[PDB]
Design a binder for these strands. Structure first.
Lengths: 76, 107, 71, 18, 294, 109
RNA sequence: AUCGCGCCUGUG
RNA sequence: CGAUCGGGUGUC
RNA sequence: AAUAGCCACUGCACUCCAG
RNA sequence: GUUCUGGGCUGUAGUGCGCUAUGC
RNA sequence: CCUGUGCAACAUAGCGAGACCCCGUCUCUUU
RNA sequence: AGGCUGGAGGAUCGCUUGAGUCCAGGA
RNA sequence: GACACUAAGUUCGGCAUCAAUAUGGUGACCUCCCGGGAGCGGGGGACCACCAGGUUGCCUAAGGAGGGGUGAACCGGCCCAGGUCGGAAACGGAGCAGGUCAAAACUCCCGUGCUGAUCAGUAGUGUC
RNA sequence: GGCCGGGCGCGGUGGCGCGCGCCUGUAGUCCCAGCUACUCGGGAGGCUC
C-alpha cells in the first residue's frame, strides 16, 4: 500500500506499537524514479510505503526523526 | 724459851713452802693446835696452848686453822725434860703419829 | 572504527551507484536490538547493535542517506 | 649532805670492829 | 670538860621533864637556878643576865607553858644560847700563800706551848711551819721553844738579845725562803703583867713584820681576868683571834662563855693538854651540846 | 648509779674535809653541840679501813653497776679481797651490805 | 700455618 | 694433580 | 712458563626457540 | 624409555704450537 | 615437524554452476 | 506468453583467502 | 712472626714447721740434816717444766734454741703500797690491789716446705 | 489466459484455504472465512498478452 506523507507516519507508529511484545519492524530506504525516494515499512503481516520528495523532506524528517527515536527506546 | 709448834708443821695437806715440816707419810690430815696440845700434855710434856696466835704462812683465818702450841724441852739447868724428846722434830713426829688415834678422830 | 568505518563503506556504495543500492533497517524491540544494512545485492554490508547509545547515529545515517536520494 | 655522809661514815666505823 | 656547870645546868633542866606541863612560876625558878650556875661558873654577870633573859623569851616563844614536856624545850633553848654564847659558828684562821702569825699573852698563859701545838697541828695539815722565839730579853724563854720545836720537828729561829724588829724580819724572811716555810709562828715575850714598854716593842714588831694573824693566848682557868687582859692586849697591840688553853682544867668555863661579848674576838683553838698534840679547833656547837650531854 | 668506786671516792672527800673541821665548827645553822665530843678521829679510821678493803678489789668489781652482785655470783672473790686486806670474810660481806644500803639511799637522793 | 708463608723473575 | 725451581727480598 | 682478549668443538646442570 | 640438527658466554671443565699484546 | 573427524540457537570471506523475484530490449504477419 | 542480459532483499554443491582455529597424540 | 717447654718474676690466699743432749739459769715439788723462842738462818740429795745461747743425731719434703702479744678477779713468775701475820723491837713472812717479765700457759707475725690463683710476659730451648 | 512476492521451522485439516515464529524481496495487494472428497472456497482492485 502507498500512503500520503502523513498517513504513513501514523501507520508506522502502529507497526512499532504492534510489535513491542514480539516481531521485527522493517524499514528500507531507496532512491526512486519510474527527485524522490521510496520509503517502506513492514511488520511481516501489514505493508506500507510512501514517496518522499525534496519539497517536503524537512517537514517530514522532523516528525519521522522524533518517531524513530521515541519508538526505538528498548535497547541495552 | 719453850718451843713453837704450828699446825702447819704437821699438815699433810700443805706443801713445803706452805709450812710442812715432816714427811707427808707421817704428816696428818688437819691437825689442830688443840689436838697437838692434848697429845703432848698426855705424855708428860710441859706445854701451853696459845689459842689465838696465827702462823704467818697461813692465808686462812678460820679457827680449825689457827693457834700455836708451846712445849718445854730442856729444863733451866739443861737436862731434857723427857729423854725421848731431844729435838723439835721429835715432838712434831710424836704428835703426827698420836693424833690419828685421838678418840675425837676415830669417832 | 567499526561504526565510523562502516558508514564510510556504505556511503561508498551509495555513491558508486545510488540507483542500484538500498538500505534496510531492522528493529526488533523484544530481543532488543537494532540492525542497519546497505546492500547492492553484490555486497552485503551490515551492522548490528544492542546498546542504547547507538540508536542516534544509526538514525542520522538513515536520515542523511535519504537526503542524498532527494537532493 | 654533811649530816648523812658524816653520820654514815661514823656509824660504819663503830659497827665494823676491825 | 665543864662538868661543874654541866651537872649544874642539868638539875635545873631535868627538874621539869617528869612534871608534865609547867607554870611560868616554875620557869622563873629554873631560870634563876640557871642564872646562878652561870655566875658561879664565873660568867660575866652581864652575859649571864642576857643568857637567861634570852632563854626566857625564846622559851615562851616556843610555847613552853603549852608543852607536855617543857624540860625539852628549855633544853633546846639553853643549848642554843650556849652555842651562841660560845661563838656560834666555828671559825679558823684563813691560810693564804704564805702566813705569818704572832702569839701573844702573859706568862703562864700557855702561849709558848700553844706555839708548838699550832706548828705541829698545821705540820700535819700539809704545811711547813717555822717557829720563832721573839723574846729579846730572856734566853731561857727562847730555849723553851727551841726544845719544843725540836720535839714537834719544826725549825726554830731565836732572836738575839735586844735584836731590832728589822733584823728579825730580814733573818726570818731569809730562813723561810731557804727552808720553804709557809707558816711562820712568832712567839712574843711573855710577862707576868702587861708591860707598856713591851707592848710598844710588840706594836713596832707588828708594824715591821705585818702578821696576818695576832693570836692572843689566854689561860682559861684565870676566868674573867683573861678577858680584861684580852681587852688590854687588843687596845695596846691588836688581837685578831683567841686561843683558850687549859680548858681540860677549866671546871667553870666563864671565860669561854664570855669571850664573844666581852672581847668580840673569835676563839680559833682550844688547849686540851700539856702535850704538843693537845690542840683542836674551837667548836661552839660541840661544847654547847657537850655541856648539856646533847 | 652508785658504784663501789663511787663510794670509795666519797669516802676520800669526807676524810679530806675532816680536819678543815675547825672552820666547819665556826658556822651557824648546825644546831646545838655541832661535832662535840669527839668521835671524828675513830670515825675516819673506819672509812680508811673500808678503803683498804676496796683496795683489794679489782676494776670489774669497782666499776660494776652493782658491786655487791658481782660477789653474790662469784663468792670466791670475797675470799681473795679478805686475804689481801688482812680482814675476815665477814668484814667484806659487811662492807658489801653497807655499800648496798649506801647505794639505795643515793638513788633515793 | 696464605702451617704447598707471601711477592717478583725467566723459559718472545 | 697448572710445567721447570732454581734465585732474591721480608726470613716469623 | 706468566697475565689478558678472541673464537670453535664436546660433556654436565640443563634451559628456551625453530624444523 | 637420561645425548636428531641449528642458534642463544647462562655457568663450569677439557682440547686447539692457534693468533695478538705486555705502560712505543 | 607430522596426523586427526568439527566450524551452533546465520554471525564466512571470495569465485563458479546459477532453486520467488525485480528492471531493460525484441516478437506475437515470419516457407 | 516466449527468448536474451544484469542484480542481488537469510548460501544446495565444488574449490581456495602467503599453511585459519595449535584441542589431542607421536613414553 | 705465632705458639710450646725448662729456668723464673709479681701479687693476694691455703696447708704445714722434729728429736734427743751438755753447761748455766728461773720456777715448782719432794727428801734429808744443823741452828734457833717465833717470823726463820744455814747445808745435802731427787724429780718435773720452762729459758739462754751451744752440739748432735744419720732426722723429715721442711724443722731456725727468730720477733711480738696476752697473762687471765684469784687460778704463771718476779717487785709488792696498804692492810695482815710472827716479833717488845729490829725486822721477817704469807700476800690482794698496782706495776712488771730471757724463763706456767695461750696466742700472732717472721722466716722455712709443699701449695691453689694472679700478673708479667723478660732468660734460654723447641716447633710451624 | 498468465502475475501482483520468495525462504526455513513449528501448528492445523482426510486435503485445500489456513494459524504462529524467524529470514528476505519488487515500481507493483486488499478484504472475507470459506470449500465439503477436491492437488478445485468467495468478493474487490491493479499490471500484462
Amino acid at each position: 500500500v502507498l500512503l500520503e506523507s502523513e498517513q504513513f507516519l501514523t501507520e508506522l507508529t502502529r507497526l512499532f506499537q504492534k510489535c513491542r511484545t514480539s516481531g521485527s519492524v522493517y524499514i528500507t530506504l531507496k532512491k526512486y524514479d519510474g527527485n524522490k525516494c521510496l520509503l517502506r515499512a513492514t511488520d511481516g503481516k501489514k505493508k506500507i510505503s510512501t514517496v518522499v520528495s525534496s519539497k517536503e523532506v524537512n517537514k517530514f524528517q522532523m516528525a519521522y526523526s522524533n518517531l524513530l527515536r521515541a519508538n526505538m527506546d528498548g535497547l541495552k | 724459851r719453850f718451843i713453837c709448834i704450828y699446825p702447819a708443821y704437821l699438815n699433810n695437806k700443805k706443801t713445803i713452802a706452805e709450812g710442812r715440816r715432816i714427811p707427808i707419810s707421817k704428816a696428818v690430815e688437819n691437825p689442830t693446835a688443840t689436838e697437838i696440845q692434848d697429845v703432848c700434855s698426855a705424855v708428860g710434856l710441859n706445854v701451853f696452848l696459845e689459842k689465838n696466835k696465827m702462823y704467818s704462812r697461813e692465808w686462812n683465818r678460820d679457827v680449825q686453822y689457827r693457834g700455836r702450841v708451846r712445849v718445854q724441852l730442856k729444863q733451866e739447868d739443861g737436862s731434857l725434860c723427857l729423854v725421848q724428846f731431844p729435838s723439835r722434830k721429835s715432838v712434831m713426829l710424836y704428835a703426827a703419829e698420836m693424833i690419828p688415834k685421838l678418840k675425837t678422830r676415830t669417832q | 572504527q567499526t561504526w565510523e568505518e562502516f558508514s564510510r563503506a556504505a556511503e561508498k556504495l551509495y555513491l558508486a551507484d545510488p540507483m542500484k543500492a538500498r538500505v534496510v533497517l531492522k528493529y526488533r524491540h523484544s530481543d532488543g536490538n537494532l540492525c542497519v544494512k546497505v546492500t547492492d545485492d553484490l555486497v552485503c554490508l551490515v551492522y548490528k547493535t544492542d546498546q542504547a547509545q547507538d540508536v542516534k547515529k544509526i538514525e542520522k545515517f538513515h536520515s542523511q542517506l535519504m537526503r542524498l536520494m532527494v537532493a | 649532805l654533811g649530816f648523812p655522809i658524816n653520820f654514815l661514815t661514823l656509824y660504819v666505823t663503830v659497827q665494823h670492829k676491825k | 670538860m665543864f662538868q661543874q656547870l654541866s651537872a649544874r645546868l642539868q638539875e635545873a633542866i631535868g627538874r621539869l621533864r617528869g612534871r608534865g606541863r609547867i607554870t611560868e612560876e616554875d620557869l622563873k625558878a629554873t631560870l634563876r637556878e640557871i642564872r646562878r650556875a652561870l655566875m658561879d661558873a664565873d660568867v660575866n654577870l652581864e652575859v649571864a643576865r642576857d643568857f637567861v633573859e634570852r632563854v626566857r623569851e625564846e622559851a615562851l616563844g616556843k610555847q613552853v607553858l603549852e608543852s607536855l614536856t617543857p624540860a625539852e624545850v628549855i633544853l633546846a633553848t639553853v643549848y642554843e644560847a650556849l652555842k651562841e654564847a660560845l661563838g656560834g659558828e666555828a671559825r679558823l684562821p684563813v691560810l693564804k700563800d704564805r702566813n705569818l702569825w704572832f702569839l701573844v699573852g702573859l706568862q703562864g698563859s700557855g702561849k709558848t706551848t700553844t706555839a708548838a701545838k699550832l706548828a705541829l697541828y698545821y705540820k700535819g695539815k700539809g704545811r711547813r711551819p717555822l717557829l720563832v722565839a721573839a723574846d729579846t730579853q730572856r734566853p731561857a724563854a727562847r730555849e723553851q721553844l727551841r726544845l719544843l720545836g725540836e720535839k714537834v720537828g719544826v725549825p726554830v729561829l731565836e732572836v738575839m738579845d735586844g735584836e731590832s724588829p728589822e733584823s728579825i724580819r730580814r733573818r726570818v724572811e731569809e730562813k723561810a725562803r731557804l727552808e720553804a716555810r709557809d707558816l711562820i709562828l712568832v712567839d712574843t715575850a711573855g710577862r707576868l703583867q702587861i708591860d707598856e714598854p713591851l707592848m710598844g716593842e710588840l706594836a713596832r714588831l707588828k708594824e715591821v713584820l705585818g702578821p696576818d694573824e695576832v693570836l692572843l693566848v689566854l689561860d682559861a682557868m684565870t676566868g674573867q681576868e683573861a678577858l680584861s687582859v684580852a681587852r688590854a692586849f687588843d687596845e695596846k697591840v691588836g688581837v685578831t683571834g683567841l686561843v683558850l688553853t687549859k680548858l681540860d682544867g677549866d671546871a667553870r668555863g666563864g671565860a669561854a662563855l664570855s669571850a664573844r661579848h666581852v672581847t668580840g674576838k673569835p676563839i680559833y683553838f682550844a688547849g686540851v693538854s700539856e702535850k704538843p698534840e693537845g690542840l683542836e679547833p674551837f667548836y661552839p656547837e660541840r661544847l654547847a651540846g657537850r655541856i648539856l650531854g646533847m | 648509779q652508785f658504784t663501789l668506786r663511787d663510794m670509795y671516792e666519797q669516802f676520800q672527800n669526807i676524810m679530806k674535809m675532816g680536819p678543815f673541821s675547825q672552820i666547819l665548827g665556826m658556822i651557824p645553822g648546825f644546831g646545838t653541840d655541832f661535832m662535840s665530843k669527839g668521835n671524828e678521829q675513830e670515825s675516819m679510821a673506819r672509812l680508811k679501813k673500808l678503803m683498804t678493803i676496796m683496795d683489794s678489789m679489782n676494776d670489774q668489781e669497782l666499776d660494776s653497776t652493782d658491786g655487791a652482785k658481782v660477789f653474790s655470783k662469784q663468792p670466791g672473790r670475797i675470799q681473795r679481797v679478805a686475804r689481801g686486806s688482812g680482814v675476815s670474810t665477814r668484814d667484806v660481806q659487811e662492807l658489801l651490805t653497807q655499800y648496798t644500803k649506801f647505794a639505795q639511799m643515793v638513788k633515793k637522793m
